[PDB]
RNA sequence: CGGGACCGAGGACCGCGCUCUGCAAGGAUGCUGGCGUAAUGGUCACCAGCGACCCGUCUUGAAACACGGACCAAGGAGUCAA
RNA sequence: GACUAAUCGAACCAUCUAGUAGCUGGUUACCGCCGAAGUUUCCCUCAGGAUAGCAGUGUCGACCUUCAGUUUUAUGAGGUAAAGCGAAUGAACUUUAAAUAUGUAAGAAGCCCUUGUUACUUAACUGAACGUGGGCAUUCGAAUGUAUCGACACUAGUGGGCCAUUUUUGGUAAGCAGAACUGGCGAUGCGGGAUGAACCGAACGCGGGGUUAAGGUGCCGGAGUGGACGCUCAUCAGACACCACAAAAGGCGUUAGUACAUCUUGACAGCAGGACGGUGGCCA
RNA sequence: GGGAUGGCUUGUGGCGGCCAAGCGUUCAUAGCGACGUCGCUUUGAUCCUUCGAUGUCGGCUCUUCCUAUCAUACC
């Protein structure tokens, strides 16, 4: 993995495969997740999922 | 122009790296003309 | 696998004396109890200095103590976790109450002749178990031949 | 425009003089002036290799250097925060003094009455004819 | 390519001070789901009107269901597809009960006969052929013939793959 | 509301609780059968299924080449002083 | 350059002597905790050196201060696409404005105001620097993360190696050769590519259960002779192809299309018939 | 002490000009371009012009394979 996606995954606390986190959607977070898209799956969770 | 930090530290105040090549050229020309004048003086003596 | 760019760091300070002195072991037990069961920061600093090596406990002289006994400190109990030495350049020793790890013979004699008191650290623990009204003093750490050569 | 030691400048080689130039790396870079001459200025730039930054020093002719606006936003915000906080203390009401990132858009309704949508094919038929 | 649905996707450019009421653009997209439908919408809009996803918004996404899924229909599809030569026009016909079934049959057909994958195919028009005389292809014309009736010779009977051995030789007559 | 698998760490009480005479609530108990010995368990030899290059050295980036090794016992190489 | 006791371009014996080698070979129990590296910068090179960087043990200091191979915001570089020119003007047009990564900045350790001096500078007490005093804590002035601090001491290997993506500069008949970043390997096991330095998945304490990735499910072989619509018949098909052979190549193989054209005013294929006169046109 | 180019190759020249179906282009009419062609490289002659080993091949015996077929067979 290149160092910038590695750093973004570290700052998102996604250090192991099948780790999941909650993110509040701002532009400053959306661009980060857009960069690490070759490693993650994300979406909009409902109340049952939460 | 990339410049060495040590060379810029040793550089005199007010002078620039943009005149270094002209400095070396002036030095070489001065040495050559000194040799030429010595040859002229010896030939005049002969 | 887990990507851990940062590394967990093991402790880089002494947790126990390297010395095999039995009385120092008893002192360490006592101040472990005091620094666990009190809130006073004095006891924790004293315990840490009881752990330390000799280059980390430089001697404190009587002239250094007399310098720090000025300006409202004349009644505070002086606490040193190293050796207290005598300074023969200091002709007049003031009255002082000093608790130290050990004293030289001349330093103890001159303090008692000036009318002060010398204490061990366990007597200090008995009389001031929270370090109230004390002056904690260290000697010059970098005043060593090797440290000059660094 | 004369410069001073400590000023922040940008480096931009302009025109046909950027043809076969030996140092393409410093074009578009920004640094601090350490040395000033009449026709050229000395700039400290940092190049970041592996984990660490290293310092480079370059000499740039003045026509390829402009003063930079790196701290302009910070100074403007410091001044506006001071004056907004003074006004807030005068009026007895709190105010926002921190920037926030852009938020997701909220719910709204779009009318259709005068703005009927135009159906688009993947290729416009006007181009096909 | 997949269980497709037909979606009406309407989008617009984000309103500005100069343009408080931007124009709305509608497309019909065949897509497996809504995420793919909106992505295809922005792809085509970028190709046509130069409206980007970041500078626009989706106004509506709706499912367009077939009006009469129990009625057999003939469909004409005008498409363009990309190959090593370039872009080629093609008109083809499908006999189905819905537009989505016609489009799925088109995708499987283009894959089978020309190796054209999903992203190389642009669907331009899907029309229901109103009259029998509008059918052009002989492979649909033979199916719309009067009093159509055929037998089924040489039918392999359905035997479970878990029954390995049979005591009688099977027949291919029904 | 059924059907199946693997597991039972801890060892007085304390806690959060609940459907509160009590409980499925900070980790398994209750009932029953055969046997009480090579039956369980273990070691060795062998067959079977799957897995599995000969060690050490050297070289470079690595392999390959090359070198040493018939077998066993005992001996065998970072010591002492300033 | 023969012979001088199987010894001769300098005999044999003992000693100095355990002579020297930078070259070759070898260098002896176990477990645990960490763990690398290949022009960075300088020196006349090869028979070259240092050195940065990367590591480990000890400590000590308030382990205080927060910082960060990341986004956002302002502003540079890339104005480059794009829209319009019922805006002006005409990639070099612009109101506006790309994707990719990228530089600089984002606080109380800060921001200004005032006071004077100046040995700077300015026409200049003018800017700037130097100090002086004061105002600003009403929110400490983006997000996310933060067992990530600092300083010493001592010790060690490696410090112009291989492969690859991307970018860039040159080339060849074809090969390819330099740089820069990043990843991998040398130091590394496991699952799959039948097999294997460089491929794909995934990184490793000892076990039980569950679920997957890459890859697979006719047999070898765990899992489908699984479902839908088509295509293909090869005198060694094809099944991990992309490069070469190799062309605007050759095919009376087989399908799907596009364009032009003919057609009940009878097309296309045939069969029955016509195929004539000036005229044996001129020259040879 | 250290060592001991390769799915290459085959039958048809190079340089220069021209033509050229086509490819491009049709706010520029440039550029590429198979098939070809044209220039350079003794009336059956002369025999009075042999143009540089750094690179190494052989022979004997004997077996087998390829086909790119000299002979035998068919066409």
Alpha-carbon gap: A29 to the closest alpha carbon of chain C (Å) = 21
PDB experimental method: cryo-EM
- State the DSSP string of chain E: --S-EEEEEEEEEPP-SS-SSPPEEEEEEEESSHHHHHHHHHHHHHHHT---STTEEEEEEEE---S-TTS-EEEEEEEEEE-SS-EEEEEEEEEESSHHHHHHHHHHHHHHHH---GGGEEEEEEEE--SGGG---HHHHTTT-TT------SPPP---TT----SS------
Nearest CA in chain B to D60: B1
Distance of alpha carbon D60 from alpha carbon D39, whole angstroms: 9
Q: Is the distance from CB of D35 to CB of D5 less than 8 angstroms? A: yes
Resolution of the experimental model, in Å, one decimal: 2.1
Instruction: Please report residues of D whose CB lies closer than 8 A to that of A25.
Output: 104
In this structure, is the CB of residue D97 within 7 Å of any atom belonging to strand G? yes
Q: Is the distance from CB of C135 to CB of C68 less than 8 angstroms? A: yes
User: In a mutagenesis test of the D interface, which of E9, E13, E39, E44 is the best target, namely the one with the most D β-carbons within 10 Å?
Assistant: E44
Is residue B10 less than 8 Å (CB to CB) from chain D? Answer: no
Query: Whole-number Å distance, CA B22 to C1' G111?
Result: 47
In this structure, is the CB of residue D78 within 7 Å of any atom belonging to strand G? yes
Place of tokens 């037909």: E6
Six-digit token pair at D3?
């410069």
**Number of neighbours of residue E98 by Cβ within 10 angstroms:** 19
In chain C, which residue ranges form alpha helices assigned H by DSSP? Answer: 22-37, 41-51, 62-68, 105-114, 121-127, 145-149
Residues 2-41 of chain A within 7 A of strand G, judged by CB, are: 2-4, 6-8, 10-13, 16-17, 24, 26-32, 35
Phi and psi (nearest 5°) for C18? -80, -15
Strand G nucleotides, any atom under 7 Å from protein beta carbons: they are 33-35, 40-42, 53-54, 57-61, 63, 68-78, 81-83, 95, 98, 101-107, 110-112, 128, 136-139, 141-154, 181-183, 202-204, 224-226, 228-231, 255-259
- Tell me the torsion sign for CA atoms C36, C41, C45, C50: negative
Nearest CA in chain E to D107: E59
**Number of neighbours of residue E108 by Cβ within 10 angstroms:** 11
- C6-12 long-range Cβ contacts below 8 angstroms, 24+ apart: none
Q: Are β-strands C97-103 and C77-85 bridged in parallel, bridged antiparallel, or unpaired?
A: parallel
Is residue D118 less than 8 Å (CB to CB) from chain E? Answer: yes
Nearest CA in chain D to A29: D101
Contact D103 A26 (CB under 8 A): yes
């Amino acid at each position: 993995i290149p160092p910038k996606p590695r750093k973004i995954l570290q700052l998102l606390r996604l250090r192991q495969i099948n780790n999941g986190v909650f993110v509040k959607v701002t532009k400053a977070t959306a661009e980060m997740i857009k960069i690490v898209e070759p490693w993650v799956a994300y979406g909009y969770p409902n109340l049952k999922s939460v | 122009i990339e410049v060495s930090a040590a060379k810029e530290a040793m550089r005199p105040e007010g002078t620039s790296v943009r005149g270094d090549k002209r400095r070396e050229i002036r030095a070489r020309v001065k040495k050559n003309q000194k040799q030429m004048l010595r040859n002229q003086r010896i030939a005049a003596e002969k | 696998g887990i990507d851990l760019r940062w590394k967990h760091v093991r402790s880089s300070h002494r947790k126990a004396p390297k010395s095999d002195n039995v009385y120092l072991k008893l002192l360490v037990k006592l101040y472990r109890f005091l620094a666990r069961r009190t809130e006073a920061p004095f006891n924790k600093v004293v315990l840490r200095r009881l752990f330390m090596s000799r280059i980390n406990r430089p001697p404190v002289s009587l002239s250094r103590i007399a310098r720090n006994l000025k300006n409202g400190n004349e009644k505070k109990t002086v606490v040193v976790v190293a050796t207290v030495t005598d300074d023969n350049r200091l002709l007049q020793v003031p009255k002082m109450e000093v608790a130290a790890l050990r004293f030289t013979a001349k330093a103890r004699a001159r303090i008692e002749a000036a009318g002060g008191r010398t204490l061990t650290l366990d007597q200090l623990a008995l009389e001031k178990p929270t370090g109230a009204n004390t002056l904690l003093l260290r000697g010059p750490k970098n005043a060593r031949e090797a440290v000059k050569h660094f | 425009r004369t410069y001073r030691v400590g000023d922040i400048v940008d480096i931009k080689v302009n025109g046909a003089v950027q043809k076969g130039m030996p140092h393409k790396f410093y074009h578009g870079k920004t640094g601090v002036v350490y040395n000033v001459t009449k026709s050229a200025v000395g700039v400290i730039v940092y190049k970041r290799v592996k984990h660490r930054y290293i310092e480079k020093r370059i000499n740039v002719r003045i026509e390829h250097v402009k003063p930079s606006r790196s701290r302009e936003d910070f100074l403007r915000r410091v001044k506006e925060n001071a004056e907004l906080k003074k006004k807030a203390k005068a009026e007895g009401v709190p105010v926002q003094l921190k920037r926030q990132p852009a938020m997701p858009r909220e719910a709204h309704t779009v009318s259709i009455a005068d703005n009927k949508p135009v159906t688009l094919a993947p290729v416009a038929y006007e181009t096909t004819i | 390519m997949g269980r497709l649905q037909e979606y009406q996707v309407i989008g617009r450019h984000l309103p500005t001070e100069a343009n408080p009421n931007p124009a709305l653009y509608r497309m019909r997209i065949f897509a497996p789901n809504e995420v793919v439908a909106k992505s295809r919408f922005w792809y085509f809009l970028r190709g046509l009107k130069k409206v980007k996803k970041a500078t626009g918004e989706i106004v509506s996404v709706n499912v367009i269901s077939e009006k009469h899924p129990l009625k057999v229909k003939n469909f004409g599809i005008w498409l363009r597809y990309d190959s090593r030569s370039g872009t080629h026009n093609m008109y083809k016909e499908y006999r189905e009960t819905s537009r989505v079934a016609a489009v799925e049959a088109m995708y499987a057909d283009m894959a089978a006969r020309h190796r054209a994958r999903f992203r190389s195919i642009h669907i331009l028009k899907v029309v229901e052929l109103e009259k029998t005389e509008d059918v052009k292809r002989p492979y649909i014309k033979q199916l719309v013939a009067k009093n159509l009736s055929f037998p089924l010779p040489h039918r392999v009977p359905k035997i479970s793959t878990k029954k390995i051995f049979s005591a009688k030789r099977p027949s291919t007559f029904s």
